[PDB]
Write a protein that binds this ligand. Structure first.
Ligand SMILES: *[C@@H]1O[C@H](CO)[C@@H](O[C@@H]2O[C@H](CO)[C@@H](O[C@@H]3O[C@H](CO)[C@@H](O)[C@H](O[C@H]4O[C@H](CO)[C@@H](O)[C@H](O)[C@@H]4O)[C@@H]3O)[C@H](O)[C@H]2NC(C)=O)[C@H](O[C@@H]2O[C@@H](C)[C@@H](O)[C@@H](O)[C@@H]2O)[C@H]1NC(C)=O
Ligand SMILES: *[C@@H]1O[C@H](CO)[C@@H](O[C@@H]2O[C@H](CO)[C@@H](O[C@@H]3O[C@H](CO)[C@@H](O)[C@H](O)[C@@H]3O)[C@H](O)[C@H]2NC(C)=O)[C@H](O[C@@H]2O[C@@H](C)[C@@H](O)[C@@H](O)[C@@H]2O)[C@H]1NC(C)=O
Ligand SMILES: *[C@@H]1O[C@H](CO)[C@@H](O)[C@H](O)[C@H]1NC(C)=O
Ligand SMILES: *[C@@H]1O[C@H](CO)[C@@H](O)[C@H](O)[C@H]1NC(C)=O
Lengths: 413, 413
């Protein structure tokens, strides 16, 4: 452990953490330096696993994950106060929140060139994970899981493949929340999603079927029919550009119906907090670096997307059969809808183990409830979180914790 | 106005109502006597319309409507306290909550034979509405709307047809919330609903397609394929009989995962309240009558369903073109899912007026939001309430009030 990176007193806490936590920089490729925030397991660090968490974007910060999803403490609406999180993932794991790629959040490079791409980012994360274990050698033995969300449906499998090549790293599994595994399945499934969740109506549905579909197999992905395109554009406008919350359809869109924030998202609370000069100091951030933003428009706009499907990477990770894989999805998200990933998993053709069923969670007074549905295959499970959006741990923390706990512990869901 | 039916001091109110309200009995057919609860418009009774509200079941009470959906006051969880409702429908209307048919709630008949059927109930309500105006002659001029929910998708159109025949009654329109307009469309649409909301998965979806469907149409209603039946039964089990809240898919099921209550519904609050002997007295209920239940198992079990589709009744009501009709649906309800009714309306073939679009509601701080989608035809509109279940005014009162206000006032939604 690099002592100088230790986080001493973090502004906004009434009482200090019972666990150690560190914040500093990992070396990536070239002259890139990625900001990390490591929170030790609240219960026996030396024998709790090591979890990497990556938020997607591309261009968005993994400190959102910490501060608004499943960190030990969550920033409150005043931008100043932090409250502990009873459902935090670091209750049972050492969680490494990594701001990546170069330029996102407090991460930078010496040359400040932040245009990048999937292969470069993968390599960058891999090298940063390497640099991590040089700094934290006592955690080289721990079980190592790679977890992410959103565009990290690309970051994580591509990374995992590189990790798979290094047997010094003790990779045990990976989990992806509302991930982007395949553009084609995501795009085709979203359109069905839109109709059957009441956004489209029959004239538009008919047109779509007519122009984009022959004999009950649709192309809403890369269809060249010009009448299909005109309708896909309409769908795109309804879903993404007309007042709905794309991250969570049943939630209001932050700030009425109309720097890069994610859409329908208020990022004030977290930004206010992390730009506090005393917070930057507590987190060993060098002063000269620009303000913190949840996402970087530059990164996102300059980002070159190369992989069109994670089918290879997942089969390549499944072939070895050392690795336990989970894809979970909020079933009211339209950014990466649950069905797209259910199709993606089903089309991996693995040996079915447990048939598709409910899975439960115990609530105070409410008793047991259905938290979602789960379909298990050999080493790979698909699972939904009923009534949760793009950011599962925010919408349904308890269900998210349960899922995660049962994942870490090789247990049935 | 029958003075003796006036409600004087209603237990559970801190301060007495500014509006008059009456509770007593209307004569139906034979020896049947239906309990009513009439709440005068809070704003100018003499020029506010007359609204009939019927809950469905069959066998369930319209006092649920009053006390838990859109009455001037709603019973609170202690079963004792009533709190005023700022979104109450009697803000702008004279709402007549009618317990029907004979045997439901405080309604009875001298002979106590409560087996009945759609044609008899229609006639019974019609005659009770007649008896109403004998008792309340000063309301014969007022605009008269017929509104209901649930099985009242049958009660209301069938009633309306009888009302249509009597020009002494000033019928101006009717509205149905998550109504049962057609068993076939309800049933076929529910199955798509189930798959695309993540409850079914692909093995079961494939089977269903294979056995219940040939190329561009499914029969999930009355299909005779024995392999189709086995799968429809599985769907029926998942949707209705396995822990989900059929009234609202994203809500917990009241009282864990396994007198007739509705399923997943806690009826304690209202029952506790209405069985209070002082409440019965205040509401001029004769003592000898049995306890109040939100639904009557006898009624429901002995009930004979005759109409299989309201297509005739609606066209018959639309032909005249004196009548303004609304069908609205919560889009997360599985009892009477929104699509079934959207299909039902679309298949009425009326002259399209306004194309399908969003409709908005203003919230405190949140600004304008999308409350749902609306598709207008001449004299008949279909409209959804996004994120609302089977009981719209409970899940989304403000949206429900707005909708209703805009309906009463012949205004665009
Ligand atoms: C939905 O429910 C309504 C109301 O109950 C039914 O209408 C009623 O049908 C019943 C019998 O089904 C009729 O009962 C009759 O009452 C009259 C009184 O004047 C008598 O003429 C008659 O008594 C003779 O017949 C009895 C048996 O048939 C004998 O045992 C007696 O001794 C005596 O000889 C009998 O008691 C009601 O008159 C009738 N009411 C109304 C308002 O119509 C619906 O029944 C349908 O419509 C009816 C006209 C008739 O065609 C029924 O067969 C139909 O089913 C009922 N609908 C359905 C689909 O069940
Ligand atoms: C994705 O991003 C990576 C990293 O930026 C790109 O690879 C890099 O491309 C550079 C410029 O094309 C390469 O620079 C060369 O370096 C040598 C010195 O060793 C110079 O003498 C030479 O003049 C170039 O400047 C760089 O080597 C390369 N880096 C790595 C780690 O491979 C990548 O570009 C694509 O692949 C590489 C291998 C090249 O062949 C490019 O032509 C090609 O576009 C980016 N991927 C895409 C699809 O754009
Ligand atoms: C965003 O959050 C801040 C801090 O929580 C709050 O004061 C503000 O009202 C929010 N802004 C909008 C546009 O909703
Ligand atoms: C039903 O409501 C009553 C009072 O409103 C309450 O005492 C009881 O615990 C409730 N049951 C459930 C399962 O919520």
């Amino acid at each position: 452990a690099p002592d100088q990176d230790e986080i001493q007193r973090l502004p906004g806490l009434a009482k200090q953490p019972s666990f150690r936590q560190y914040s500093g920089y990992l070396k990536g490729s070239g002259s890139k330096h990625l900001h990390y925030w490591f929170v030790e397991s609240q219960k026996d660090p030396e024998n709790s696993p090591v979890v990497l968490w990556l938020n997607g974007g591309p261009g968005c910060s993994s400190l959102d994950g910490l501060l608004t999803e499943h960190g030990p403490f969550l920033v409150q609406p005043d931008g100043v106060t932090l409250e502990y999180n009873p459902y935090s993932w670091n209750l049972i794991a050492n969680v490494l929140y990594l701001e990546s790629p170069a330029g996102v959040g407090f991460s930078y490079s010496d040359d400040k060139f932040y245009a990048t791409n999937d292969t470069e980012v993968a390599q960058s994360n891999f090298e940063a994970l390497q640099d991590f274990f040089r700094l934290f050698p006592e955690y080289k033995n721990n079980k190592l899981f790679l977890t992410g969300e959103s565009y990290a449906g690309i970051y994580i499998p591509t990374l995992a493949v590189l990790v798979m090549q290094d047997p010094s790293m003790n990779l045990q599994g990976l989990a992806v929340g509302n991930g982007l595994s395949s553009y084609e399945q995501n795009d085709n499934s979203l359109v069905y999603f839109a109709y059957y969740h009441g956004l489209l109506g029959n004239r538009l549905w008919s047109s779509l079927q007519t122009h984009c579909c022959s004999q009950n197999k649709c192309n809403f992905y890369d269809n060249k029919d010009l009448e299909c395109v005109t309708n896909l554009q309409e769908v795109a406008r309804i879903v993404g550009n007309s007042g709905l919350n794309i991250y969570n359809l049943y939630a209001p869109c932050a700030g009425g119906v109309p720097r890069m924030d994610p859409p329908c998202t208020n990022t004030t609370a977290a930004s206010t907090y992390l730009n506090n000069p005393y917070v930057r100091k507590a987190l060993n951030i060098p002063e000269q670096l620009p303000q913190w933003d949840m996402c970087n428009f530059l990164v996102n706009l300059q980002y070159r997307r190369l992989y069109r499907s994670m089918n290879s990477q997942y089969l390549k990770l499944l072939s070895s059969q050392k690795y336990q894989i989970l894809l979970y999805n909020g079933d009211v998200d339209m950014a990466c809808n649950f069905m797209g990933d259910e199709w993606f998993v089903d089309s991996l053709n693995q040996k079915m183990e447990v048939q598709r069923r409910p899975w439960l969670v115990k609530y105070g007074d409410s008793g047991e409830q259905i938290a979602g549905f789960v379909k298990e295959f050999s080493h790979i499970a698909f699972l939904t979180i009923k009534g949760a959006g793009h950011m599962v741990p925010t919408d349904k923390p308890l269900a998210a914790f349960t899922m995660f706990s049962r994942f870490l512990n090789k247990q049935p869901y």
